[PDB]
Amino acid sequence: TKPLDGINVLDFTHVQAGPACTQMMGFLGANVIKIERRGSGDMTRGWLQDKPNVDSLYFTMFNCNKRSIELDMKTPEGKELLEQMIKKADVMVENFGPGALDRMGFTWEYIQELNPRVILASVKGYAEGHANEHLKVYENVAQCSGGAAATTGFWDGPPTVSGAALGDSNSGMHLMIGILAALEMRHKTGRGQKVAVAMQDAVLNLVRIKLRDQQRLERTGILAEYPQAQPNFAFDRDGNPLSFDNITSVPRGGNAGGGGQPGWMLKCKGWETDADSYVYFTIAANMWPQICDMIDKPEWKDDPAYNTFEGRVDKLMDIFSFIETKFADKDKFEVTEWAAQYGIPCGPVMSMKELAHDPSLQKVGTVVEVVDEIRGNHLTVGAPFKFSGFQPEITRAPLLGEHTDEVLKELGLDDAKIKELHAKQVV
Amino acid sequence: TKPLDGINVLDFTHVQAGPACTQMMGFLGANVIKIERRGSGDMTRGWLQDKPNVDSLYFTMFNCNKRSIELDMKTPEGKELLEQMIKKADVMVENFGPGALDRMGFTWEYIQELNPRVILASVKGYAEGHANEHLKVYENVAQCSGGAAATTGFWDGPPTVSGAALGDSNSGMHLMIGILAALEMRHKTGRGQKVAVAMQDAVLNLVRIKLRDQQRLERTGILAEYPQAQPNFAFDRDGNPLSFDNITSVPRGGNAGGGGQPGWMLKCKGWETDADSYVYFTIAANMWPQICDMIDKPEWKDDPAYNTFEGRVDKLMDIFSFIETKFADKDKFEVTEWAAQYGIPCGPVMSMKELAHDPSLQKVGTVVEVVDEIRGNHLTVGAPFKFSGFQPEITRAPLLGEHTDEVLKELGLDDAKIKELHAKQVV
Numbered sequence: 001t002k003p004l005d006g007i008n009v010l011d012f013t014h015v016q017a018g019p020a021c022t023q024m025m026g027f028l029g030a031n032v033i034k035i036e037r038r039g040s041g042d043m044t045r046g047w048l049q050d051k052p053n054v055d056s057l058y059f060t061m062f063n064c065n066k067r068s069i070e071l072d073m074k075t076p077e078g079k080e081l082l083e084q085m086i087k088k089a090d091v092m093v094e095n096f097g098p099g100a101l102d103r104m105g106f107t108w109e110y111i112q113e114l115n116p117r118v119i120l121a122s123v124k125g126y127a128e129g130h131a132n133e134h135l136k137v138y139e140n141v142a143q144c145s146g147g148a149a150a151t152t153g154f155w156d157g158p159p160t161v162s163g164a165a166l167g168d169s170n171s172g173m174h175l176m177i178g179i180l181a182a183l184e185m186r187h188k189t190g191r192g193q194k195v196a197v198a199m200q201d202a203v204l205n206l207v208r209i210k211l212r213d214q215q216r217l218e219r220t221g222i223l224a225e226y227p228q229a230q231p232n233f234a235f236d237r238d239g240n241p242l243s244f245d246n247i248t249s250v251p252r253g254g255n256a257g258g259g260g261q262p263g264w265m266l267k268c269k270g271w272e273t274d275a276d277s278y279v280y281f282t283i284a285a286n287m288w289p290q291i292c293d294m295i296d297k298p299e300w301k302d303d304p305a306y307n308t309f310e311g312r313v314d315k316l317m318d319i320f321s322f323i324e325t326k327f328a329d330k331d332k333f334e335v336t337e338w339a340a341q342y343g344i345p346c347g348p349v350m351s352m353k354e355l356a357h358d359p360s361l362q363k364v365g366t367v368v369e370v371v372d373e374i375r376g377n378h379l380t381v382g383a384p385f386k387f388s389g390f391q392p393e394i395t396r397a398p399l400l401g402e403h404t405d406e407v408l409k410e411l412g413l414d415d416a417k418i419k420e421l422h423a424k425q426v427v
Numbered sequence: 428t429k430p431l432d433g434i435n436v437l438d439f440t441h442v443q444a445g446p447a448c449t450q451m452m453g454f455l456g457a458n459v460i461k462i463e464r465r466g467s468g469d470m471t472r473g474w475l476q477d478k479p480n481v482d483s484l485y486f487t488m489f490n491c492n493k494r495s496i497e498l499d500m501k502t503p504e505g506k507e508l509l510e511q512m513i514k515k516a517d518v519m520v521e522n523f524g525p526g527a528l529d530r531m532g533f534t535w536e537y538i539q540e541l542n543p544r545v546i547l548a549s550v551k552g553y554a555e556g557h558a559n560e561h562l563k564v565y566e567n568v569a570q571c572s573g574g575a576a577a578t579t580g581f582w583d584g585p586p587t588v589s590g591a592a593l594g595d596s597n598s599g600m601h602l603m604i605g606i607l608a609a610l611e612m613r614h615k616t617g618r619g620q621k622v623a624v625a626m627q628d629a630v631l632n633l634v635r636i637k638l639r640d641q642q643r644l645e646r647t648g649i650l651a652e653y654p655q656a657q658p659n660f661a662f663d664r665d666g667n668p669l670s671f672d673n674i675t676s677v678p679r680g681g682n683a684g685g686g687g688q689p690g691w692m693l694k695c696k697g698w699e700t701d702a703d704s705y706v707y708f709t710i711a712a713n714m715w716p717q718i719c720d721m722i723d724k725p726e727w728k729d730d731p732a733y734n735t736f737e738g739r740v741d742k743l744m745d746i747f748s749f750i751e752t753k754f755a756d757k758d759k760f761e762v763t764e765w766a767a768q769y770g771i772p773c774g775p776v777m778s779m780k781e782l783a784h785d786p787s788l789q790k791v792g793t794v795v796e797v798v799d800e801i802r803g804n805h806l807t808v809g810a811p812f813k814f815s816g817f818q819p820e821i822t823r824a825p826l827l828g829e830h831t832d833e834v835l836k837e838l839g840l841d842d843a844k845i846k847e848l849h850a851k852q853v854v
């Protein structure tokens with residue numbers, strides 16, 4: 001039925017990286033128990049709340065399909081409770097810090113000794129053995145360390161962070177691959193393992209394409225598909241011309257194609273008003289003829305100066321400039337449709353508002369409405385992977401310690417035993 | 428031990444999304460066989476080559492740990508081999524445009540019949556059932572459809588694509604999650620499933636925080652941590668203030684924090700000539716004091732209009748402007764160290780040049796030196812996940828059809844018959 005039914009997960013994570021990971025596992029049928037700080041809880045609960053004292057959307061959108069229990073781990077009894085839980089867990093996940101978990105006394109060594117089958121998964125800022133093996137890291141810093149910032153934005157501008165969670169959720173998804181990889185291994189050894197993912201590494205993996213460019217640039221001195229390859233097109237804030245004669249590290253290429261064919265972000269009707277009135281237009285080599293037909297430029301079909309990638313290198317930006325001219329009186333969708341008739345890869349820039357109420361995404365289960373009778377329903381992103389014989393069942397995020405009792409019981413303890421922990425405040 | 432040792436992968440993928448997925452599976456021990464078009468193969472082979480007649484870096488960096496076989500699938504004998512091969516595979520991965528595999532006659536249905544244990548995994552532009560179900564999609568088109576573009580960049584600029592491969596490799600890694608999940612299911616039902624990942628959904632999943640903001644905006648009409656929230660700081664076309672008045676869709680916030688505490692991208696010594704001479708300075712709350720200690724500024728710690736998130740969302744950009752002045756005569760690293768003391772979340776913008784040759788990343792195996800005796804060594808990104816009892820062994824990319832015979836024999840074909848497939852031009 002569900003990929004991870006019967007997999008018990010001890011979630012010590014907070015914020016985004018770890019939470020995203022365990023939430024996805026939970027979507028695949030895993031039993032996720034989130035161990036939070038007594039009284040405070042995951043710091044995302046009171047982060048940018050849309051309504052006072054109600055768990056914020058930051059928390060609910062990253063902690064669905066999870067149960068919560070409040071436990072003070074800097075406590076002797078708190079550390080014992082873990083042992084009862086670690087012995088029942090299939091996998092433990094945590095962020096905290098380089099050695100936050102270690103200082104609590106639960107080291108990889110002690111854990112294996114407690115449960116030879118358990119898997120320990122962690123998200124770090126930098127890989128163990130890295131000069132910055134100690135630093136605390138947040139989203140944007142990871143983007144900077146991984147090469148995404150340096151290669152995102154414009155040549156006449158500063159390194160730009162991406163709206164997408166390249167360092168956080170991306171790290172989470174990568175950690176998921178590690179955990180599942182561990183699970184597949186265990187089937188062959190009946191022995192658990194420790195898996196770790198550094199945010200810098202998760203970012204570098206998505207920036208693979210740029211490491212390709214750095215080498216091409218070192219070997220040839222030029223990146224022909226970049227705007228800077230066009231003579232006198234790009235300039236710095238002081239008007240100095242930018243060419244590859246002086247570029248030694250992969251530059252920002254604005255809205256150039258990256259790993260796709262050459263492309264550019266083109267304005268559409270109303271761009272002055274609607275910040276998202278644009279389409280991404282691609283000029284694939286195998287499709288020049290079609291482009292020429294669409295823009296009424298038959299003379300360009302046979303012109304050696306226009307019919308090959310190499311020939312377009314010195315005028316590509318002028319061509320996009322002209323193409324853009326044909327979209328002046330059309331909206332994103334009209335342009336997207338018009339291009340579709342020609343089979344040209346063209347897509348509109350979708351605004352969050354549009355994405356949130358899009359029929360398609362809700363129909364396929366990517367944008368899901370979570371039934372939350374306590375905080376009120378809210379939208380969330382479902383499972384990006386669709387299966388032929390499995391449908392995720394997404395349920396609301398837990399209230400702080402909502403299942404502390406429910407859990408302590410499942411362990412075996414009883415009413416009286418529990419009550420003591422509540423008093424001593426170990427729970 | 429190798430997580431996927433013994434897993435046979437029938438790889439029909441090309442370009443980036445699918446290849447990234449199979450290459451990583453191979454990095455984890457999987458036996459990957461790449462089926463390519465005859466004479467030409469994966470279009471990445473001759474895509475921006477650095478040396479004529481030599482597989483490009485685009486191809487080698489996404490196809491290590493794989494064997495290559497050529498096959499004309501629009502051939503009767505070609506289709507017999509695939510069927511024969513699907514019988515020996517655990518999972519088949521594909522990323523040809525919508526319905527391409529079906530037209531070849533290999534739909535999910537027929538595939539299940541040929542082998543009940545085989546998992547069919549694929550990447551597409553949009554989810555099955557989506558209004559844009561049948562559109563061909565490249566990297567940035569998916570970044571636009573998934574909402575990353577609309578939320579990346581600046582308010583006074585256009586939608587901006589990320590240098591990171593939000594659409595391709597990101598979908599590839601998500602497809603890997605789906606495949607491992609399907610393998611965990613088969614370990615129980617004893618049968619394979621069909622798994623798919625839409626690039627739009629892969630992107631949406633990393634843009635989760637923006638779906639958070641869109642709801643926050645609808646419910647409250649404002650985003651306090653966004654640049655537009657500050658009293659006339661950002662301006663539109665005409666010289667006039669911006670605010671969440673008339674802003675109904677999550678806007679672009681330049682270099683704001685996003686999934687973490689506030690912050691900005693600050694210039695450092697030489698930023699005029701060094702495009703990557705910047706650091707990212709995060710102003711968290713639980714250390715506002717320390718910040719005041721470095722920025723030698725104690726008048727804030729005791730100024731309510733300064734020591735709180737709410738008591739600062741009106742002059743955020745003013746502090747940043749300030750702090751940047753203190754970085755004026757220092758380099759990324761100097762600024763990072765001078766800050767690291769106060770355990771502050773400050774990080775340098777790493778350039779591709781620095782990352783490609785960072786000794787640290789190569790020690791931990793994140794950036795790996797691939798021994799390629801045929802083409803010459805090249806760098807690549809290794810496995811982002813580190814395992815306590817497993818180290819990947821990265822092998823060079825295959826030449827077109829380099830392993831055709833070797834594989835046609837693993838099936839059972841004889842020395843002569845193979846010579847016929849070559850003659851008939853199916854191989």
Ligand SMILES: CC(C)(COP(=O)(O)OP(=O)(O)OC[C@H]1O[C@@H](n2cnc3c(N)ncnc32)[C@H](O)[C@@H]1OP(=O)(O)O)[C@@H](O)C(=O)NCCC(=O)NCCS
Pocket residue numbers: 014015016017018035036037038071072073074095096097098099100101103104123124125135136137138139167168169199713
């Ligand atoms: C959030 C972060 C970036 C900085 O965090 P922070 O505010 O310093 O909080 P920490 O997690 O480091 O915890 C501080 C201390 O409280 C402790 N603590 C956490 N939960 C606790 C609990 N329930 N009971 C008792 N102590 C607890 C930690 O173990 C740590 O102890 P230590 O000082 O002995 O190391 C940090 O978690 C980190 O560097 N995490 C990895 C980052 C990551 O994954 N970032 C992507 C975020 S989505």
Ligand SMILES: CC(C)(COP(=O)(O)OP(=O)(O)OC[C@H]1O[C@@H](n2cnc3c(N)ncnc32)[C@H](O)[C@@H]1OP(=O)(O)O)[C@@H](O)C(=O)NCCC(=O)NCCS
Pocket residue numbers: 441442443444445462463464465498499500501522523524525526527528530531550551552562563564565566594595596626
């Ligand atoms: C590259 C892409 C974007 C546009 O591709 P394209 O140049 O049109 O090529 P296609 O993959 O669609 O293939 C064209 C045809 O050749 C066929 N073909 C592919 N390999 C073949 C082979 N070895 N032998 C015979 N025919 C073959 C395809 O099956 C298809 O047939 P059809 O016209 O009957 O549908 C397309 O693959 C696509 O939309 N892919 C999903 C996109 C994706 O994952 N993008 C992220 C990129 S990393």
